[PDB]
Design a protein around this ligand. Sequence first.
Ligand SMILES: *[C@@H]1O[C@H](CO)[C@@H](O)[C@H](O)[C@H]1NC(C)=O
Ligand SMILES: *[C@@H]1O[C@H](CO)[C@@H](O)[C@H](O)[C@H]1NC(C)=O
Ligand SMILES: *[C@@H]1O[C@H](CO)[C@@H](O)[C@H](O)[C@H]1NC(C)=O
Length: 308
Amino acid sequence: LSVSIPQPSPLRVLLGTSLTIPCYFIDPPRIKWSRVSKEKEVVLLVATEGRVRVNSAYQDKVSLPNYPAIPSDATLEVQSLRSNDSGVYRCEVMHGIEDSEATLEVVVKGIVFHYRAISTRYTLDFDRAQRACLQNSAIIATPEQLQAAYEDGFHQCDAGWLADQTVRYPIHTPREGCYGDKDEFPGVRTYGIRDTNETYDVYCFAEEMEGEVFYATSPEKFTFQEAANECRRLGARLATTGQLYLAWQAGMDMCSAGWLADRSVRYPISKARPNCGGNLLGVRTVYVHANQTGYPDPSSRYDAICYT
Ligand SMILES: *[C@@H]1O[C@H](CO)[C@@H](O)[C@H](O)[C@H]1NC(C)=O
Ligand SMILES: *[C@@H]1O[C@H](CO)[C@@H](O)[C@H](O)[C@H]1NC(C)=O
Ligand SMILES: *[C@@H]1O[C@H](CO)[C@@H](O)[C@H](O)[C@H]1NC(C)=O
């Protein structure tokens, strides 16, 4: 029997959107969809004789849309794409003693990050929240993107605007003053549709980044103006928050503090990368505190985080 996935290998899809992997087989039967992510492989579903049995974790998430209406079409559909769903998907068709397989890499692009232009909380109406997202090399995040970010581990007890004019915030362990509409249950708390002129923070979605982000330093660091002038001296400019988080997502160790474009300094952190300046290999991390952001005096001395 023959199996084919007619799609170029680096299949790129956005965060929170859907995914369709075409898989067609010829049998001169049982279908299995699995996914290898780094070192872990997860069986997504197994179909046979018209019935599909789906992984419990991927319930209402993966499906075979054209099966069994077209019994020779093992096309897979994956909904609500979190950045975890990246990896190499395997479509394997087996009959009796024969079996064939095909693979396809999926790269879920984009990252959802918080923005608050100054240390003052909740200062952006809907329009100016969108403007802040635009000025930080991003768009205003859709609620699906924020849901995927929460499913990936994002948590911040700060209400922020979204694309659908709603104001939400994700939380895994409910805290005092952070329960919202989910009681003491985890989830993405929402305030519903709000008036276009209510002030909150913003949740932005940074999709892609064509240039590169790097640290420009000096023996005495830089004041903010010196950092901007150092970036401009190298034919570059101070990286925005979206560019910073896109570089940090791509694997660049941006944990060290440095001047960003908006006179702010962020310390990106996660459960996988909780340390800075090194790593503690004999220790695993379960919980990690929310991302920290300082709005230092313009005279403070840091590295420059330039983008080119
Ligand atoms: C920090 O922000 C990044 C990007 O917004 C996110 O992926 C990460 O989960 C955040 N960390 C925490 C602990 O919320
Ligand atoms: C990613 O997905 C795998 C398989 O579903 C799961 O075991 C793992 O905990 C997830 N990790 C993150 C960081 O989302
Ligand atoms: C916002 O707009 C509404 C209706 O357009 C108006 O009544 C209200 O005064 C405005 N400001 C605030 C803070 O709600």
